């Protein structure tokens, strides 16, 4: 059943699994019409599909053309997410197909189950974890490829860069969730923390800066401080 704090190590075992987050699939700006009514204008979106063990990210870019002439878009977005994940699984060799898919939002369960009826051995699971994958569009290189897309496109990334050369997949996932949680709580502050020192750059083939082991400990500390400050504010405590 549900993925929680109790069964967290299961993410880093040798059973292939993917997280699917649909929170950036259907994106809009809300605006006033000439007549003073309100209207939405869709922008490019993305499915965030991640192997938490390998760091392999299957970023499917959802171009605004997919919404043209469609009704009830927030509902369609769940089914289009389910279609695209099902298409990805069928495109993978058998030995690369996941044994489990964990959806970050419970509303994805029925759409994904129905699209994966052909795969009765792949378990579709919810999670009780509050994962910050919505902040994926705060990673500059991922935001850039989504906004530039002129057509439906799949782009492959490693969201852990080369971290697994030095740390385990448990530690790499913990670093990722902390960076994304910071970016979600205070984007400006988080980005300031990550770039402030101009001598540490992002490699052309990476998403995050090339921090030494010591510099990551300082960064990780600065992100925890940012998250607690913001929390005191949010709740007056």
């Amino acid at each position: 059943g549900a993925m929680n704090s109790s069964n967290y190590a299961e993410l880093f075992n040798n059973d292939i699994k993917l997280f699917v987050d649909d929170t950036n699939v259907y994106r809009v700006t809300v605006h006033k019409t000439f007549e003073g009514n309100v209207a939405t204008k869709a922008i490019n979106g993305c499915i965030f599909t991640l192997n938490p063990k390998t760091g392999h990210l299957f970023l499917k870019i959802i171009h605004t053309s997919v919404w043209a002439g469609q009704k009830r878009l927030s509902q369609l977005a769940k089914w289009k997410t389910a279609e695209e994940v099902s298409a990805l699984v069928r495109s993978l060799p058998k030995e690369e197909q996941p044994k489990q898919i964990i959806v970050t939002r419970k509303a994805m369960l029925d759409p994904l189950e129905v699209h994966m009826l052909d795969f009765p051995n792949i378990a579709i699971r919810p999670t009780e974890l509050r994962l910050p994958f919505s902040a994926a569009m705060s990673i500059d290189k991922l935001s850039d490829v989504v906004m530039k897309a002129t057509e439906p496109q799949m782009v492959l990334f490693n969201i852990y860069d080369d971290w697994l050369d030095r740390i385990s997949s448990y530690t790499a996932f913990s670093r990722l969730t902390l960076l994304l949680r910071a970016l979600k709580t205070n984007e400006e502050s988080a980005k300031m923390i990550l770039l402030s020192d101009p001598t540490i750059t992002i490699k052309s083939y990476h998403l995050w800066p090339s921090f030494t082991d010591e510099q990551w400990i300082t960064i990780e500390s600065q992100m925890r401080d940012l998250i607690l400050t913001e929390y005191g504010r949010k709740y007056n405590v």
Binding site: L76, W79, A82, E83, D110, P111, E113, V114, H115, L117, D118
Partner: protein, 300 residues
Amino acid sequence: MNTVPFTSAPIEVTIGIDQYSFNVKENQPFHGIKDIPIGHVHVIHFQHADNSSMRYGYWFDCRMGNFYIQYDPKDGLYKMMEERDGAKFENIVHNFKERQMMVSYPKIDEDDTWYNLTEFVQMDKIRKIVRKDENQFSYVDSSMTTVQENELSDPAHSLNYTVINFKSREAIRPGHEMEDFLDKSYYLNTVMLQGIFKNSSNYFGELQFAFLNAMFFGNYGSSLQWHAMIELICSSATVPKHMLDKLDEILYYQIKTLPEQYSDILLNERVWNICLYSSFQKNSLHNTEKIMENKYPELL
């Protein structure tokens, strides 16, 4: 007007005949039920005074043979049996009637309740759901599981209701996943009506039979089947107008006949709220919505 004689009543038992019921005392001179209306299926049913566990009973149609009940002290139940000797049977019944040892099927002339509950139920369909081909009558009880329940364990004692599963390849056409999940019209009209039941009369017959097994025996799998058949129609955007009008009548008499005290266990909150207030057919079940709102407003 047909008769189901009883050899004897050696154990204290509540006896049901359709929607009626009578208490019989241990060794009471009871020799059966007369004046049973020809033209309908009927169900005779039993609950022992000493074990109000296992309600059990027999579906039968008096046009298909001469049936009687006899207690079996070994298996410890009232059994239905067929008498093949017509002259022995007529002579048994005539004796019991002359001695006035039979209860009279107590139908009010104005009262269409039983017709309304069994309109589409046919013995030949019952005998395909309840398989025991050496008998012309069908045994059901509280505990019997459905083919569907067994999949999710003695196949001979199963209820072979048509399997309905909204998240099955049968229900969902490849490439029409969202369309077919949110609008069950293809599953209702092509797979179930044209494909399996052949017509709406067979579909309604199974729906009515599942309800009656749920109500008379508290059979849980039957209750699941009744709700699933209602939900498949209410969740379809495109249903023939005659089917919606007839469904409204069927459900009205089912809700009217349900004992008031069993609404907690026999009615599924989610299905009824969805069917009356959210579904495509939310506005198509006027009679059913009015009786449900006036008799069970707590459920909704």
